[PDB]
Design a protein around this ligand. Structure first.
Ligand SMILES: NC(=O)c1ccc[n+]([C@@H]2O[C@H](COP(=O)([O-])OP(=O)(O)OC[C@H]3O[C@@H](n4cnc5c(N)ncnc54)[C@H](OP(=O)(O)O)[C@@H]3O)[C@@H](O)[C@H]2O)c1
Ligand SMILES: NC(=O)c1ccc[n+]([C@@H]2O[C@H](COP(=O)([O-])OP(=O)(O)OC[C@H]3O[C@@H](n4cnc5c(N)ncnc54)[C@H](OP(=O)(O)O)[C@@H]3O)[C@@H](O)[C@H]2O)c1
Ligand SMILES: NC(=O)c1ccc[n+]([C@@H]2O[C@H](COP(=O)([O-])OP(=O)(O)OC[C@H]3O[C@@H](n4cnc5c(N)ncnc54)[C@H](OP(=O)(O)O)[C@@H]3O)[C@@H](O)[C@H]2O)c1
Ligand SMILES: NC(=O)c1ccc[n+]([C@@H]2O[C@H](COP(=O)([O-])OP(=O)(O)OC[C@H]3O[C@@H](n4cnc5c(N)ncnc54)[C@H](OP(=O)(O)O)[C@@H]3O)[C@@H](O)[C@H]2O)c1
Ligand SMILES: C[C@](O)(c1ccc(C(=O)N(C2CC2)C2CCN(CC3(C(N)=O)CC3)CC2)cc1)C(F)(F)F
Ligand SMILES: C[C@](O)(c1ccc(C(=O)N(C2CC2)C2CCN(CC3(C(N)=O)CC3)CC2)cc1)C(F)(F)F
Lengths: 265, 262, 265, 262
């Protein structure tokens, strides 16, 4: 797709209608807060109504045009599909879908745990496809945007996150393929894949907590960079504390192999 | 990590190898080459009758031995027991070649979740099930896992979204546990094969309607060598340009940087 | 250095005072014309007064705030040094120095021709150092800019241009080193190295003329991209007809090796 | 283009090698290693008396033979005749190791053109003069040119501008004629060495005032192996990171793309 040629401005999001999944904690809660401050309409979801209600309330205090939540688990494809309909009804439509939630995971060597690999595939990848299918009609109306949160470990290999990484790699293959289909079908819905390094969320800090030696990036600036890449219809957003990463992560060869195919049928 | 030496057909003689997806195409070609080198081979696929004919040409070609066990890799119980059966038959396992795929649609994606799920189950999740079932024996032999993949499991193409998800998922999963095995000192190698267009009957059916196609029998040999030599990646396309562009040295640099965290 | 954060606008060059060397033909003449159209003051040089006079006249018709030329050969270090003084006097100072000239060269296998290697070093590299030394006082006054025209063959290796390529590589080592010195000395003069693929100038078209199979880029758009990179104080400008080139030419590893040194004394 | 094999000291026994800049530092270490391997060696530098002592330790260490010819590489007539003299003395040339540099100032550049010119003459132009003089003999032996260079001849550093110009110029010139020799089928290899900080007395004098330094004697061996094995580049630094970052695979990809124009 083609990015907006112009600097991000907070106003771009005023009055927009935006779903954020996995928004009761961590990066998704910060995205909800940034959206509130921008005067957006927001619907947030996750499994926990109590934690969601606090986000909603804080969003209203922050200046959210409106804010609501709907709770359920993204293990359930029926919930996933219905949540989008309910959300689009609560707001009168949909400009941007931000898919962020993952299944609970911890760092461990992979041994035996196919159930964890399947659940990660289901919750972290397949639910995102089900949300996008539910959302696409409204997004076509609005010429909207899908934002997909992924990870450095959906681009390069690390130990201890085998199932997680499978699922983040799947999101790159899937949404990157359909982005190429949206170009040849003339569908004007952007797809932004967010590639994040370690971010200082509470779940992550608890797991890497003087247990593994690395520097975390701030979760609020992370959340705004995600929303910006989305608003400006960028293909990929990269966010990490290290400049080695930001310089070495892009893959110009892949872009050339894609262009060679793209230009010969 | 790789083998010092150049490939020699004798590396496989007497070796105990499973080949999945071996009724048709590249997997059939691998069964052949392995037989022509004197390996023990257990092959699998859904086509019982066509597997019979495959296992017989293998014996004709020199296999130390050959068996097939038919079933669908839609079924994780079957994937799991197939590996136990295949190991009893050979008294061990030196090499696990994972090659099967479910049938893929060259179509735009619209709303078929069922097909996305099934591609994931057969193209990816079965590979993990089989790997989990084969590891005890492969640890006992310092064996090899070979994982067959695709240009579309390294770069994005329209019309193959579910397939490319499943092929990218493989890279993520197997490249992670490869880091894991390096750190926990598991001496089982993992080779990922990245193939451009190969002239198999499946591919030639789907694309009929040019793209240059590489020889399925050369392809299948390249895969076995890669695995025999314990290489991380094998690339096989008919265009030298394509094989140049497939390498990702930034990724391998970044993975080194990141490992000093651990 | 730090680029201007903002889009190029033609106005940026209105009233600026700009030397262009090698400006009687090819890319440098186009740069002179682009500068004229922008309302800049320009002084152009090269060995040939007649061809220079035509450029000057055309520049005045195009809207040049002023335009003059001074002729001499850049084999002569005394000329080079004095030309800058004369030019800065003609204009009352100096905002931008564009070093562009090269010695006449053709495509040939290297055999025996040390004289050609030395003359290329002298004219294509050493004269640029002598111009920059002469210019630096005025440029410090103006917080000005040095623009250095180089080539893909000052970044990667081709046959048939051995001496030329030596000289273009030397310019990258020299000016890139002094750019790092300007950062630690707090000298606010930018240095832009222009890395060009085949451009459709008459001298080049004559040499590659159905003799070697390649696609040329347009010389006028090339010339404007050079001036823009300069005005916006970019470190490097890349210009080639091929997108393989523009994606693969940058060297993020070199930038990381530079940053690692830069941040430890 | 490279040699199939691993390095063996016997590759140099009986070999006819020039080493420039061999009075002091890395070039002295190379003269030694080459003697300890039984090469014929002609060494050069300006220090007559110190060259004498070098040529004598070479004989003690096992050289098939050893000579020095003293002169300054400021003088192109000398560079030229030195190679003829050195070849008569050995009856040929198998390897030309170009290693000398003029003395470098760690200072900011301000206005010293004379020093920029002289660095270019001694660090670069002399290398080309010597190469032109040595090529007939090297063609006759399928020999090797080895060109010693630096981090600062691949990336930019403040305080060494004239030196880095001369070291980048070498990369440009010699990498071009290397393409040229590939196309015109000249069977002389060209190796470019890219060195980080080495613990030579010169370097240790200049930087005294940390940076980790690599062993000059290991360094000098790495250079000779690279050249013996006919490799394009040799990289030698004490940090593995540094040696990872020095490689430029985009450049080598782009040079392939661009060669199909020709
Ligand atoms: N933090 C990092 O270092 C890092 C690094 C790279 C990428 N990322 C990506 O950033 C995103 C957010 O991570 P984060 O660290 O902010 O995570 P987090 O703080 O742990 O939040 C996870 C969110 O997902 C929800 N969730 C968990 N299981 C769910 C289920 N079955 N159904 C619906 N929601 C469920 C949780 O709420 P409930 O449990 O109440 O349901 C929570 O709201 C993820 O996609 C992650 O991969 C994070
Ligand atoms: N050929 C190409 O252009 C190309 C390009 C990139 C990658 N590759 C990769 O190469 C590998 C082989 O490809 P190919 O062209 O040889 O394909 P193929 O000829 O269609 O063979 C696929 C194999 O998988 C088996 N299979 C299909 N469904 C199965 C199921 N449910 N359970 C168990 N086995 C099943 C098939 O046998 P049954 O139907 O008898 O079960 C067949 O033996 C694949 O991993 C593919 O992605 C090929
Ligand atoms: N064209 C390309 O494909 C290409 C590709 C990559 C990089 N570049 C770079 O772009 C720049 C311009 O190239 P171009 O193709 O536009 O060249 P051009 O058209 O041949 O112009 C060369 C200019 O330099 C002048 N010149 C030659 N020898 C000189 C001397 N001794 N003293 C002063 N001026 C002298 C010529 O005028 P007089 O002879 O009258 O003195 C002429 O004005 C060069 O730095 C070149 O390396 C060009
Ligand atoms: N050591 C490092 O940290 C480092 C780092 C990067 C690259 N390198 C490269 O390694 C090579 C050797 O460096 P080094 O540290 O060994 O330097 P060195 O010890 O200073 O030796 C330079 C050699 O060149 C000779 N030389 C100096 N001026 C000469 C002249 N005018 N004519 C002929 N010979 C002359 C010197 O001998 P005389 O004075 O007797 O003439 C000496 O034998 C150089 O190419 C250098 O750039 C070294
Ligand atoms: C869910 C969870 O918070 C998580 C899971 C995966 C990631 C993740 O995406 N990360 C990459 C850096 C982006 C992780 C990759 C794994 N690192 C730790 C390790 C490392 N070597 O960096 C394996 C030890 C932690 C961050 C971050 C956090 C955790 F609980 F697993 F930590
Ligand atoms: C002075 C001259 O116009 C010239 C000299 C060098 C270049 C130059 O910078 N070029 C690189 C592409 C930017 C050349 C590099 C050499 N190519 C021709 C060759 C090729 N393989 O591309 C060697 C045959 C022509 C363009 C362009 C033009 C010429 F006369 F030599 F052509």
């Amino acid at each position: 797709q083609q990015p907006l040629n112009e600097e991000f401005r907070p106003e771009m999001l005023q009055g927009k209608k935006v779903i954020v999944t996995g928004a009761s904690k961590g990066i998704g809660r910060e995205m909800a807060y940034h959206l509130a401050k921008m005067g957006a309409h927001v619907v947030v979801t996750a499994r926990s109504k109590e934690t969601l209600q606090k986000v909603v309330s804080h969003c209203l205090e922050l200046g959210a045009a409106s804010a609501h939540y709907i709770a359920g688990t993204m293990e359930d494809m029926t919930f996933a599909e219905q949540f989008v309909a309910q959300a689009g009804k609560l707001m009168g439509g949909l400009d941007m879908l931000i898919l962020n939630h993952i299944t609970n995971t911890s760092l461990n060597l992979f041994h035996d745990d196919i159930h964890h690999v399947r659940k990660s595939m289901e919750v972290n990848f397949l639910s995102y496809v089900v949300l996008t299918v539910a959302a696409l009609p409204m997004l076509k109306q609005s010429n909207g945007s899908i934002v997909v949160v992924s990870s450095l470990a959906g681009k390069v290999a690390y130990p201890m996150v085998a199932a997680y990484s499978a699922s983040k790699f799947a999101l790159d293959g899937f949404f990157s393929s359909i982005r190429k289909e949206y170009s040849v079908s003339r569908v004007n819905v952007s797809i932004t894949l967010c590639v994040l390094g370690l971010i200082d969320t509470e779940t992550a800090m608890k797991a890497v907590s003087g247990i593994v030696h690395m520097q975390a990036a701030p979760k609020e600036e992370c959340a705004l960079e995600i929303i910006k890449g989305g608003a400006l219809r960028q293909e990929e957003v990269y966010y990490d504390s290290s400049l080695w990463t930001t310089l070495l992560i892009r893959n110009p060869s892949r872009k050339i192999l894609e262009f060679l195919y793209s230009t010969s049928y």
